[PDB]
Amino acid sequence: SIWSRVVQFGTGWGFWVSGHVFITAKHVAPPKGTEIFGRKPGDFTVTSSGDFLKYYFTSAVRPDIPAMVLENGCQEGVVASVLVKRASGEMLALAVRMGSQAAIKIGSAVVHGQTGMLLTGSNLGTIPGDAGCPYVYKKGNTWVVIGVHVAATRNTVIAATHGEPTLEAWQA
């Protein structure tokens, strides 16, 4: 039912963080100024950082869902889940062990994000166009989304992250 937040968007996918917030990969989104979800610019604002694109609608587009916590990446070693969807409607929860930050070239830009190692169990990975799918993990009792899928390397993936932490500190 968290899978219902992951929806086809542009040439990739997107995720509903809340009823007002929709995040996706910048490199798969429709052109700047395109009417989406029956909403035109003015009904929503747009912010971005690297390949992370964030839509905020003044009116709720998804009433059925509560706000999920969005955080700028996560601790290294934490096993997250990339919620991958396909055109056929197939759902693939890929376990990814998040690691260090790195840079990569997607289109005409060099973008940054937190890398991750795809975990093979004992029983394929991502394709281009899985881009925009969310990286989620459970924080004790609470679900947290930490970023959107950017790309896979030539078992390493990388997710675009976003957000200014609530806590601020110090001036060395």
Residue numbers in the entry: 4 to 126, 132 to 162, 165 to 182
Excerpt from the paper describing this PDB structure:
Whereas ORF2, ORF3 and ORF4 each encode single proteins, ORF1 codes for a large polyprotein (∼190 kDa) that is processed by the virally-encoded protease at five specific sites to release the six ‘mature’ non-structural proteins (NS1/2–NS7)—and an array of functional precursors—that are required for virus replication. The viral NS6 protease present within the C-terminal half of the polyprotein performs all the processing, including its own autocatalytic release from the precursor. Norovirus NS6 is a cysteine protease with a chymotrypsin-like fold: two β-barrel domains separated by a cleft that contains a Cys-His-Asp/Glu catalytic triad similar in arrangement to the Ser-His-Asp triad characteristic of serine proteases.
To investigate the structural variation in substrate recognition we also made an NS6 chimera which interchanged the residues P4-P4′ of the NS6-7 cleavage junction with the sequence of the NS2-3 junction from MNV (NS6 4′ 2|3). The modelled monomers start at residue 4 and end at residue 182; in contrast to the other structures reported here, the A chain lack density for the tip of the eII-fII loop so residues 162–163 were omitted. The A and B chains each extend their C-termini into the cleft formed between the bII-cII and eII-fII loops of a neighbouring molecule. The packing arrangements are distinct but rather similar and, once again, lack specific contacts that are consistent with productive substrate binding.
